Amino acid sequence: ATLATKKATLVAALKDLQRVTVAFSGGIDSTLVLKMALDVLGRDNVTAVVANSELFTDEEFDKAMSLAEELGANVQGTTLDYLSDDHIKNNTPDSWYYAKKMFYSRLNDIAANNGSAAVLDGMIKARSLLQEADFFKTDVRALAQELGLTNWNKVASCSVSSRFPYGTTLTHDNIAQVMAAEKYLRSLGFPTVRVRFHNDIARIELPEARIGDFLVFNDRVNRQLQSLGFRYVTLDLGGFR
Amino acid sequence: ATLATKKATLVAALKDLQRVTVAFSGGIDSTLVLKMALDVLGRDNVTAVVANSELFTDEEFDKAMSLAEELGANVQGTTLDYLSDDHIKNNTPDSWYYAKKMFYSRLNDIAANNGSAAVLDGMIARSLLQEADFFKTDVRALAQELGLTNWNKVASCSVSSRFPYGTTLTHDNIAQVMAAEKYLRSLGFPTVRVRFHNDIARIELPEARIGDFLVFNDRVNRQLQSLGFRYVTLDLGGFR
Amino acid sequence: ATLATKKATLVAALKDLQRVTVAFSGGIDSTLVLKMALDVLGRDNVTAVVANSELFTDEEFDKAMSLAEELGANVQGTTLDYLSDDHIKNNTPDSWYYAKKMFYSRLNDIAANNGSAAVLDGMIKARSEAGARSLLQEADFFKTDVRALAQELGLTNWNKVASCSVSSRFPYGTTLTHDNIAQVMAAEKYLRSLGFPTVRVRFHNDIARIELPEARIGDFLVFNDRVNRQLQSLGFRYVTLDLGGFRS
Amino acid sequence: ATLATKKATLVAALKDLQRVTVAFSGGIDSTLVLKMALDVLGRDNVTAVVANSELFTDEEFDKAMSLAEELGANVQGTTLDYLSDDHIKNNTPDSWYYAKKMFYSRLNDIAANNGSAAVLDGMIKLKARSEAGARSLLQEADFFKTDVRALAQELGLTNWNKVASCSVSSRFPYGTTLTHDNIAQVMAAEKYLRSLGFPTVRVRFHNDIARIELPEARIGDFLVFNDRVNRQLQSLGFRYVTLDLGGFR
Amino acid sequence: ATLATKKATLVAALKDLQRVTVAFSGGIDSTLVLKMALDVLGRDNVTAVVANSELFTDEEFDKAMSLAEELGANVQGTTLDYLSDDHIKNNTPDSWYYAKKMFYSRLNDIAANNGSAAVLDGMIPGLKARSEAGARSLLQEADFFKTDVRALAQELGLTNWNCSVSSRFPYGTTLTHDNIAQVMAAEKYLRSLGFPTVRVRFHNDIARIELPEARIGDFLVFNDRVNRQLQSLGFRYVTLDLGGFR
Amino acid sequence: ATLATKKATLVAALKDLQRVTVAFSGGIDSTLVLKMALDVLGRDNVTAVVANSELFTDEEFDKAMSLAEELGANVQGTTLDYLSDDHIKNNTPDSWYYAKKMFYSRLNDIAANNGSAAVLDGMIKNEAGARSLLQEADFFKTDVRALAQELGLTNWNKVASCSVSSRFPYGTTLTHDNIAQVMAAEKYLRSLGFPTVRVRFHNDIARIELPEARIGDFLVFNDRVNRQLQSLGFRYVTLDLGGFR
């Protein structure tokens, strides 16, 4: 289809819902949904909710809260303690299962309190309207460009649980350790980076085309990540993913 | 804290001034102010001013003069002789102050003489984008809304910072430093300083670009030597 | 002299033509012509045409078609077989000319069959021989006038990077075939997917001569072996990197 | 004393022994002992023995066998199963002692079966050697490292192992149990890395993690090989293949 | 059996020929043959010959000539025009054979004119190039392995010892005096920048540089100088093989 | 001439001198001279002299003293005060001349007092109180380690010592402090794996010259070298884009 046909399904789907609460993370997808809902449904009939968790950075939470205000939405912060579930706290392979299970249960209850007909997320190809309207990665960038949206989270980052091996118990300490390492690495000019936690070993994942540029920082990163508690600081030769 | 609320603040403030003179550098901030001023006050009530100076590049001047005309403004070039002032010519730690005073005094005289209510600049003189609480994100959202895509993106700094305190700035050693930085930028290094130390050139690059730079060592060495440096070096501390 | 007089010359030229066919590449210039043509003459009186050929990417074609639909134009792709012309098939130094004569004759025939008064291209200040109009050139548009009017019409999206014919990857006198062209484009596509958007894979039979911007060559080294084996499996015997860098 | 007096002490000790078996590693010290032994007692009365084990690389074994023959000695390889001793298999700080103990007793049996009066090693100015009865003639004659370099030049000796081979056990943390499998894993990984042009390298074993140590001044050169090293070491059984940012130690 | 029995066959064979001409390259193999012949037959009955050709560098020749003088042989250079033979000039896959045929014919012509009983080399499309010449490889007849030659080189006290440029050209490409000088100048320039192991493969207007992969990072600082130098030697395009040397 | 004849000229020339004093730096040329002198005249009539000075490192001096003993020589250290001469102290373009005059004048006094017939150095092909026997016998660089390998010689200083004067511009006054500064910087750089290096002194700027083929390898050390040379007193630490020499 044309982008206009997919955009029309999205307006038509939204009018049919009349009042929605939209799970807003700040990535390009959720920024498109949040804006489309505000444009078809009005400020007072769309609720943006930003999840606060121990698994995400305060900066990503703060950036989404600020773009939702910048977009003109009533946005509400709700804080989730993902670590209360021992399936998640011990990061067993089902651990995504309960994390999504907790995210949507908080989101479903919020919709009852402001009278929305459904809560929307930003999944592409709970209702995920961009997938129902058959939006692909190229379609989402095209519509956002047409809607004048310029600011969104270019740092498509993930819950910090993905840095830990299955069976490792998450702690306030080792999560902060992983996140302080990634924040330090990003401050040197590597916006895409993972610091995988392996007890005494830190395993750094960088995009392969950035590894040559990284070499000037080896010693400072080595000494900095050792001061955060790692005994050995290493670079994955496989790169990011 | 909506963009629509800040844009109304900026429109309202511009309506209260009626006739404005805009300090126009050509960056996104000053280009946003110049269009907003044209859209609410009209061509005949806005004067765009572009400083022609020895401390900034002719490329920055030519691009700004053309971008003001392209946006639909009446544009005026004014030329500042910063080196006639001995505080700037001798590069003291206070020279920035005298340079800013000479610049804002010329802009005040133009605005007084064309009947403007204020001089405007792009800071985030009135800085209305700062008064309306525009952030870098707000400014990119409004420029897209006005259909503005074209502006200079090479961040501009006075060439004074390339010289040690106590150094006498001259037309020749300024031209030397600027030809060197223009050459380096043309190789693909948009953020670069050639600090001047008489017979030594001290190059600052972002540390993450120094590996990429090595394929050019010999050409940079020979080019900056032909520009008058005897030794061409790379600071191991990098940019800053 | 002023933009407003230049915009009026263009409006008048379009009103006089009443019905037009637009050669649409997706760049800023043809995007401005198509937008003005749609605003002045209406959707049913404008046909946007995007050429599909073996000498350009299927990506480039898909994006140009999508840019014309996004503007609100009825757009039709036409398919050109440039290799049927022996100046192009044998990559003579004048082959660009025969490619454009063939392109403009197809556009003239499309215009004849839908009732347009002219074919419009986006040239500014072999088309003289087919009768294409460059209304921006006639109205004295320079690059800054195009950027000014596009911003006053709210146009922000277009192709920022011009397309070059894959003919430029082959030495003069080399015979282009559906097979070796597919080789050059698959090699360049693989390279772009590793993070090198500006690249050329020059064809010298058993040798691929890769052109990269010199500032990226340090970044490229982590890929030497994968590029070597990938381009060999595409049919090259030797995979090399030009020491002069991109366009030397 | 003088180099000449020390050289005469060494000559005298060898003539009194008549027939010797020489523990030959290829380093400068055992190379001096073997050369002196051949110069004083002749090819027919000297047996050079080179230990082959799974704790040292096959490349070093072949190089020592060739350095011994090139010097003119009858040279014999013996194979040691160091993992048969559990003091060695359990990677304790005294495991080196039991490895030397097993090596010196095999040399004693070889010495008994070829009629030698002593086993000679190349030690200069400790308890496994002395328990076994091996003699260190350079130490008895009071050779220091400079004396060994002096007499080596006098005899025209130029070729020897500059690299000192270390046991693969140092790639494993203390208390990690050595196995035929994890040793072969570490040794094949290092062998591939050396074959790319990196003679000084360690692959430290961390179960599913391989931690590569290279001299920092070579890490820039290594970049062209990351992807092949990753897949090669993954095919050897490591899940993760990493480069230590600290370099070689 | 033992090394002493293997060198014993070589003593006997050398004693029976009395006067020999020795094809001398300077590698470990030919230096042992030349030293054995001098020790068994004496200086006045041994002629060492070193081939000088356009397909090798004047340094390879100069190093080989000294090697034989230091061994104690009377040494003689002969110069061959390998490009006169069209198997070699057109770089067919067998031209190594025809180069050795021309070499052994010149050496047989040298040996007949000084009266040697045979031509000796250091070895361990038609008839084998030696057998067709009559050349003996005495180290091969004595069943020498690479260890025996390294062993025997030390029992006689040997201390000093040591590729055709055709391998820079594709099969079917015509060798000329000029493109040979071009390739040889290009490799000398690269070696002088610190790359002792290097090949400049000639592909007409394209130079394809082969380097050990572990040196390509070090090479980048030289790209532009190498590009312009090899262009000035006559190449239009100067490239680096991503597969590296070998 | 053949290498064997050049060796005979050297043997004959050494036998005609009977007792020699050898200027010994530890490089290949002077170790070849020192070895030939011992092999032809015997230890008791060869005196090896190693100059200790502020313009060369203590590390090269100790290595040279120990290499002479390893060669079989009686070795004697002598101390030179190069900075006592004002051409050297003020780094005039003349200073090489006064440094060589002071070096050879000291060696001649040692030679006179131990009864040697000549002072020997290791100069080759391509002072008047010095014989360079390798030069008289027409030895080239190829001849020297052809012959050095025939004597089995392996240990010698493989990177060339140069006077620290070349790290300072002509006209700069050399002092104990700025020499110590340059010498601690080059020693640090060598300790990271860069045996061939110059730290050129330009007051508050250090200009590091490295062989161009090593500059890619050096990037992993930029920050450590920057901080180390700053702690030695340099304000700016830079890398010459032209590389070494």
Choose among F208, F216, F236: nearest Cβ to B202: F236
Structure tokens that stand for C100 in this block: 């454009």
Torsion angles phi and psi, residue F2, rounded to 5: -75, 155
Same domain (yes/no): C13, C62: yes
B8's torsion region: left (phi>0), alpha (psi -120 to 50) or beta? alpha
Spell out where chain C is interrupted, by the residue before each break (C to N > 2.5 A): 125
Chain C nearest-CA distance from A208, in A, is 7
Residues of A in contact with B2 (CB under 8 A): 69-72
Assess B217–E contact: CB distance below 8 Å, yes or no: yes
Structure tokens that stand for B202 in this block: 């001290």
The 10 Å Cβ neighbour count of residue F191 is: 10
HEC states along B122-143?
Answer: CCCCECHHHHCCCCHHHHHHHH
Torsion angles phi and psi, residue A158, rounded to 5: -125, 160
Same domain (yes/no): F173, F119: no
Choose among D153, D217, D219: nearest Cβ to F153: D153
The answer to whether residues A146 and C157 touch, using CB atoms and an 8 Å cutoff, is yes
Choose among A70, A150, A217: nearest Cβ to B2: A70
- Measured distance CA(E101)–CA(E129) in Å, rounded: 6
Assess A211–C contact: CB distance below 8 Å, yes or no: yes
Choose among D69, D220, D225: nearest Cβ to E151: D69
Which subunits have 3 or more CB–CB pairs within 8 Å of chain E? B, C, D, F
Residues of E in contact with C207 (CB under 8 A): 203, 206, 208, 239
Same domain (yes/no): C97, C9: yes
Assess E2–D contact: CB distance below 8 Å, yes or no: no
Residues of B in contact with E226 (CB under 8 A): none
What's the Cα-to-Cα distance from A104 to each of A80, A97, A119, rounded to whole Å?
Answer: 11, 11, 9
**CA neighbor of D192 nearest in space, from D218, D221, D160, D231:** D231
Last residue of a domain, one of E134, E163, E192: E163
Interface touch D157/F152, C-beta < 8 Å: yes
Same domain (yes/no): E113, E17: yes
Assess F242–E contact: CB distance below 8 Å, yes or no: no
Interface touch A212/C219, C-beta < 8 Å: yes
Which subunits have 3 or more CB–CB pairs within 8 Å of chain F? A, B, D, E
Residues of D in contact with A208 (CB under 8 A): 226-227
> Which 3 state secondary structure label does DSSP give A130?
helix
Number of Cβ pairs < 8 A linking chain B and chain C: 46
Best to test chain A binding among B207, B210, B234 (most A CBs inside 10 Å): B207
Residues 6+ apart with CB under 8 A from B24: B30, B31, B34, B48, B49, B50, B64, B68, B73, B75
Same domain (yes/no): F14, F115: yes
**CA neighbor of C216 nearest in space, from B211, F120, E227:** B211
Same domain (yes/no): C66, C173: no
Of D166, D173, D179, D200, which is the active-site residue?
D166
Q: Which amino acid is at D153?
A: Q
Interface touch C218/A208, C-beta < 8 Å: no
D34's torsion region: left (phi>0), alpha (psi -120 to 50) or beta? alpha
Same domain (yes/no): B136, B202: no
Same domain (yes/no): F132, F148: yes
Name the residue in chain F with its Cα closest to that of A220: F223
Chain C nearest-CA distance from E97, in A, is 26
Instruction: Report the domain count for chain A.
Output: 2
- Measured distance CA(B37)–CA(B48) in Å, rounded: 10
- Measured distance CA(E77)–CA(F139) in Å, rounded: 23
Name the residue in chain F with its Cα closest to that of D157: F152
Asked whether the CA dihedral E219, E225, E228, E229 is positive or negative, the reply is negative
Last residue of a domain, one of F138, F162, F186: F162
Same domain (yes/no): F131, F145: yes
HEC states along chain E?
Answer: CCHHHHHHHHHHHHHHHCCEEEECCCCHHHHHHHHHHHHHHCHHHEEEEEEEECCCCHHHHHHHHHHHHHHCCEEEEEEECHHHCHHHHCCCCCHHHHHHHHHHHHHHHHHHHHCCCEEECCCCCCCCHHHHHCCECHHHHCCCCHHHHHHHHHHCCCCCCCCCHHHHCCCCCCCCHHHHHHHHHHHHHHHHCCCCCCEEEEECCEEEEECCHHHHHHHHHHHHHHHHHHHHCCCCEEEEECCCCC
Choose among B202, B214, B237: nearest Cβ to F215: B214
Residues 6+ apart with CB under 8 A from E222: B218, E193, F212, F213
Q: How wide is the angle at C-alpha E4 spanned by C-alphas E1 and E10, nearest 5°?
A: 95
Same domain (yes/no): B137, B232: no
> Which 3 state secondary structure label does DSSP give B232?
strand
Residue E64: exposure state from Cβ atoms within 10 A (0-12, 13-18, ≥19): buried
What string of DSSP letters covers C58-90?
HHHHHHHHHHHHHHT-EEEEEEE-GGGSHHHHT
What pairing do the DSSP bridges indicate for beta strands C46-53 and C20-23? parallel
The answer to whether residues A53 and A82 touch, using CB atoms and an 8 Å cutoff, is yes
Assess D71–E contact: CB distance below 8 Å, yes or no: yes
What pairing do the DSSP bridges indicate for beta strands B74-79 and B118-120? unpaired
- Measured distance CA(F119)–CA(F107) in Å, rounded: 7
Interface touch B1/A212, C-beta < 8 Å: no
- Measured distance CA(A151)–CA(A147) in Å, rounded: 12
Which subunits have 3 or more CB–CB pairs within 8 Å of chain A? B, C, D, F
Give the active site residues of E: 163
The answer to whether residues C88 and C167 touch, using CB atoms and an 8 Å cutoff, is yes
Of F1, F8, F159, F162, which is the active-site residue?
F162
Residues of F in contact with A217 (CB under 8 A): 223
Residues of F in contact with D32 (CB under 8 A): none
Assess E94–D contact: CB distance below 8 Å, yes or no: no
Q: Which residues pair with F118 in a beta bridge?
A: F20
Assess F113–A contact: CB distance below 8 Å, yes or no: no
The answer to whether residues E118 and E130 touch, using CB atoms and an 8 Å cutoff, is no
Residues 6+ apart with CB under 8 A from B69: B75, C144
Question: 């051409």: which residue's tokens?
Answer: F87
Structure tokens that stand for B5 in this block: 């609320």
**CA neighbor of A110 nearest in space, from A74, A82, A84, A144:** A74
Same domain (yes/no): A150, A166: no
Resolution in A: 2.4
The 10 Å Cβ neighbour count of residue D126 is: 10
Assess F241–A contact: CB distance below 8 Å, yes or no: no
Helix or strand (DSSP H, E) at C208:
strand C207-211
Q: Which residues pair with F22 in a beta bridge?
A: F48, F120
Residues of B in contact with E225 (CB under 8 A): 218
Interface touch F152/D158, C-beta < 8 Å: yes
- Measured distance CA(C183)–CA(D149) in Å, rounded: 62
HEC states along D210-242?
Answer: EEEECCHHHHHHHHHHHHHHHHHHHHCCCCEEE
Torsion angles phi and psi, residue D56, rounded to 5: -135, 160
Residues 6+ apart with CB under 8 A from A28: A140, A141, A144, A152, A153
Chain D nearest-CA distance from C27, in A, is 38
Residues of A in contact with B141 (CB under 8 A): 70, 148-151
- Measured distance CA(C63)–CA(C75) in Å, rounded: 12
Assess A209–C contact: CB distance below 8 Å, yes or no: yes
Residues of E in contact with D224 (CB under 8 A): 213-214, 216-217
Structural domain harbouring B73: 1-157
Residues of B in contact with C219 (CB under 8 A): 212
Residues 6+ apart with CB under 8 A from D241: A236, A237, A238, D210, D212, D229, D230, D233, D234
Choose among D146, D153, D220: nearest Cβ to F220: D220
Same domain (yes/no): C41, C137: yes
The answer to whether residues E19 and E115 touch, using CB atoms and an 8 Å cutoff, is yes
> Which 3 state secondary structure label does DSSP give F30?
helix
Residues 6+ apart with CB under 8 A from A223: none
The answer to whether residues F218 and F190 touch, using CB atoms and an 8 Å cutoff, is no
In chain D, positions 122-181, which contact chain C (CB-CB < 8 Å)?
Answer: none
Choose among F150, F211, F216: nearest Cβ to E160: F150
Which subunits have 3 or more CB–CB pairs within 8 Å of chain C? A, B, D, E
Of C69, C164, C226, C247, which is the active-site residue?
C164
Last residue of a domain, one of B131, B157, B183: B157
The 10 Å Cβ neighbour count of residue C173 is: 9
Assess B233–F contact: CB distance below 8 Å, yes or no: yes
Strand order in the sheet with E199-203: C200-204, C207-211, C238-242, E237-241, E206-210, E199-203
